[PDB]
Amino acid sequence: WLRRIKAWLRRIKA
């Protein structure tokens, strides 16, 4: 969750 969602941040555009 420190490498997938930090990039999912890119997918979620949170």
Asked whether the CA dihedral 3, 9, 1, 4 is positive or negative, the reply is negative
- CA-CA distance, 10 to 3, in Å (whole number)? 11
Q: Where are the alpha helices (DSSP H) in the chain?
A: 5-12
Tokens in use for 12? 């979620």
Q: How far is CA 3 from the centre of its chain?
A: 7
CA dihedral 5, 2, 14, 8 (to 10 degrees): -20
Give the single-character DSSP code of 3.
Answer: S
Residue found by looking up tokens 């555009």 in the block: 13
d(CA 12, CA 1): 14
For residue 2, give Cα distances in angstroms to 8, 13, 14.
10, 16, 15
Structure solved via: NMR
> Which amino acid appears at position 4 of this protein?
R
Angstrom CA distances, 10 to 1, 2, 3, stand at 14, 13, 11
